[PDB]
């Protein structure tokens, strides 16, 4: 059962960027061998970090301006959007890994640090 949610320009803006919670987002395209290989890894990642971090996916073929605005130039790309409560703001970082265990460790470290 799918642990990540499929985001649209509207829900990515509303739930992630204007949100009060942490997200990892997989920016992908459907015609993409690498994206296809990574999809079940991203689901594993979503299941690993559930309840600390939400997981979303953005189809960059369907929504090219959203992906362009997020600085995405190749697929797949994973970004962490973390909420800093005291500053009421979302901080983003691209995580250059295709491995769920690796990405989870990196996310958890980033969440520990101011």
DSSP code at position 10: H
Technique used to solve these coordinates:
X-ray
Instruction: Please tell me the distance from the alpha carbon of residue 71 to that of residue 66, in angstroms, as a whole number.
Output: 9
The total of structural domains in the chain comes to 1
Q: Which domain does 48 fall in, by range?
A: 1-114
Name the token pair of 28. Answer: 């992908």
The angle at the Cα of 102, spanning 16 to 58, to the nearest 5 degrees, equals 30
Could you write out the DSSP letters of every residue in 44-110? HHHHHHTTT-EEEEEETTT-HHHHHHTT--SSSEEEEEEEEGGGTEEEEEEE--S-HHHHHHHHHHH
Instruction: Please tell me the distance from the alpha carbon of residue 100 to that of residue 20, in angstroms, as a whole number.
Output: 24
- Which has the closest alpha carbon to 49: 10, 21, 89, 9? 21
Classified as helix, coil or strand, 26 is strand
Q: In this structure, what CATH number is given to the domain that contains residue 7?
A: 3.40.30.10
CA distances from 81 to 17, 22, 31, 32, 40 (A): 8, 6, 26, 24, 21
Task: Determine how β-strand 54-59 pairs with β-strand 23-28.
Answer: parallel
The resolution, in angstroms to one decimal, equals 1.9
CB 24 within 8 A of CB 94: no
The angle at the Cα of 83, spanning 39 to 51, to the nearest 5 degrees, equals 55
For the chain, how long is the longest CA-to-CA vector? 41
């Amino acid at each position: 059962p799918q642990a990540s949610i499929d985001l649209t320009p509207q829900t990515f803006n509303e739930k992630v960027l204007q949100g009060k919670t942490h997200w990892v987002v997989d920016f992908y395209a459907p015609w993409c061998g690498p994206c296809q290989n990574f999809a079940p890894e991203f689901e594993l990642l979503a299941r690993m970090i559930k309840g600390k971090v939400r997981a979303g996916k953005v189809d960059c073929q369907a929504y090219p301006q959203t992906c362009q605005k997020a600085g995405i130039k190749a697929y797949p790309s994973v970004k962490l959007y973390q909420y800093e409560r005291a500053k009421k703001s979302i901080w983003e970082e691209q995580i250059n890994s295709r491995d769920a265990k690796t990405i989870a460790a990196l996310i958890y470290g980033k969440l520990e640090t101011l």
